[PDB]
Amino acid sequence: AYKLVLIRHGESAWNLENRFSGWYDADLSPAGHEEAKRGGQALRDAGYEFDICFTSVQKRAIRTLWTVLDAIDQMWLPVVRTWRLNERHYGGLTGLNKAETAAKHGEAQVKIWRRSYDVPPPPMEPDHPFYSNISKDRRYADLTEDQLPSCESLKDTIARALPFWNEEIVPQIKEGKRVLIAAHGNSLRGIVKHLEGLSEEAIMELNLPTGIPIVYELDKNLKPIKPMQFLGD
Amino acid sequence: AAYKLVLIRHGESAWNLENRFSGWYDADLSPAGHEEAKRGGQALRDAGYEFDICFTSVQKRAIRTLWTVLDAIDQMWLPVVRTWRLNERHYGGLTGLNKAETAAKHGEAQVKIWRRSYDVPPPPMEPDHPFYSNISKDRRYADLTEDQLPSCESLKDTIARALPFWNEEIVPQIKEGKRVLIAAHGNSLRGIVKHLEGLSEEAIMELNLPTGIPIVYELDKNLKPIKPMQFLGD
Ligand SMILES: CC(=O)Oc1ccccc1S(=O)(=O)Nc1cc2c(c(O)c1O)C(=O)c1ccccc1C2=O
Ligand SMILES: [Cl-]
Structure with a gap:
């Protein structure tokens, strides 16, 4: 898998x-x-x-x-x-x-x-x-005025993470590429939500641990075959 | 410059x-x-x-x-x-x-x-x-063709496989107006400097690029230097 x-x-x-x-x-x-x-x-x-x-x-x-x-x-x-x-x-x-x-x-x-x-x-x-420090940071300069958030609900955060997962990450997985994702609690929440088809209430309860590899084993449909697993001791 | x-x-x-x-x-x-x-x-x-x-x-x-x-x-x-x-x-x-x-x-x-x-x-x-296995069988070269994975190189060979990347992947970015940083190796950068300044084989072999020092080029729209390379530091 x-x-x-x-x-x-x-x-x-x-x-x-x-x-x-x-x-x-x-x-x-x-x-x-x-x-x-x-x-x-x-x-x-x-x-x-x-x-x-x-x-x-x-x-x-x-x-x-x-x-x-x-x-x-x-x-x-x-x-x-x-x-x-x-x-x-x-x-x-x-x-x-x-x-x-x-x-x-x-x-x-x-x-x-x-x-x-x-x-x-x-x-x-x-x-x-932080207003100008973030909103005028040049790394966001190509973002359209609607893409650059002044604030986000969890829903908003997940909505802008998933298009990237769907368009860029998924294709790589389907070609047998072994993928590593290093990101943040709330953007990771979005991926975990889509993977396991969790509910809004369940994803708000999920608190991913930090600094620990989180392993998913997925089938051909990118559905997890088991619960997430952790590496260490 | 442009x-x-x-x-x-x-x-x-x-x-x-x-x-x-x-x-x-x-x-x-x-x-x-x-x-x-x-x-x-x-x-x-x-x-x-x-x-x-x-x-x-x-x-x-x-x-x-x-x-x-x-x-x-x-x-x-x-x-x-x-x-x-x-x-x-x-x-x-x-x-x-x-x-x-x-x-x-x-x-x-x-x-x-x-x-x-x-x-x-x-x-x-x-x-x-x-070091044969260490290099020749390292999976980072898994996608190279038999011809591309070298058993050895003259400076000429090195430059010949470096310039294709320069012309196809770097040049277009520069002409797209992207400001490029290239962090690489003496001999691979030699190929770039040789092409930019149009240097002779002997001129390039005499060229010693210092480790860890930034080299700046001011290029025209055809990627021709308006002046000699400059080092950055104190
Ligand atoms: C006998 C030997 O080459 O020793 C070494 C090993 C590592 C660095 C420098 C030396 S050296 O004292 O001979 N001087 C030295 C030696 C060499 C070079 C070079 O630029 C240099 O300064 C090369 O470019 C070079 C290029 C291609 C083949 C051999 C050499 C080479 O042998
Ligand atoms: Cl990187």
Whole structure:
């Protein structure tokens, strides 16, 4: 059967994973970097080989991929980057911790955003410290005005990840290419949702572990033949 | 000028230290080599350089150099294209041997001939060579045709398989207005510099490109340099 591996990057700098890092291009913390090395060794020890790699345009995922490729001696593999595998864009909340979020928007609204599949946070306004840093970053310059999010619901995030999966990743899998995907919790959520045909409520409950190879065994229809599996101990 | 092109030769490798012929052997950077690539990156960063696409070989000394550069300039998001065609010259049976071993087996004279010759290849790497499997059977070359997978190369051979990539994959990008970074190897970059400046065989063999230093070209719309290559740094 086809074999697919996913890896979610680990910790980013300045505690930004607990601060709605979203589309801000936070680097890995040294610890986050160590997780990626540990995961790389798991794959080396297991003798995994890949033919193509997919990642986002965010450095925390890219450096995670680099760390894995280094560890398994396949730095020579072709690599494809796409904004479509970016983390969820958290709009105005980006960079705020939990207390600052509650203080600014209230517990009632924050709880609603947290449990909703289709409600976006408020948009990142020009007064936001990250507004121009992200919205005018040249890596998004070719994006149409509607493709470049000011904010995303989980639904929005999954909707823009899947076209890439369908058009670019699927064809590779169907040609027997062994695929590695290094991305983010919410973009990975979209792939896991489509693969296992999960429900909105179920995908919002799924919390993929970080820095750990996630292995899928798929049949000819790209349906999983078993639950996701993890590498390590 | 209409276009700007940046080249960089990989930093010092672990085998450059041991003074062994690497060629297609996938030797990694030495720590100094990594520091060189880093300084190259900082130079590019201080000068405000921006790229849109990166080309490199399938050898990690060039790749890690590119990685180190992309890190220094905060452009890790750029698309990266890897090709064997940008690989170091394939040193055949000399692969793995050092200076002494090479002179010992072949004599100083023969070494002189190979050194100064543009089109005379070293002896072939044969099935009993200790790095034969390591290179000739590495799956990264699985898709090469029988003719393409070399047992050895003269500089001429190297340039001949490197230029096709330049003309078909790099040139169109440049004329598309994409700012190109090429992180590769001495002899593969030699082919590009030879074509750009229209150099003679003797002129190119006399050309020593420094490890880990950025080489900048200002090109006209026909990819002709308006001025001599420039190095970047302090
Ligand atoms: C006897 C031998 O070649 O030793 C080695 C081994 C590694 C590096 C340098 C040497 S060296 O002292 O002889 N000097 C040295 C030797 C050589 C070259 C070169 O540029 C150089 O500077 C080549 O380009 C070269 C190209 C093709 C075949 C052989 C050589 C070669 O043999
Ligand atoms: Cl890469």
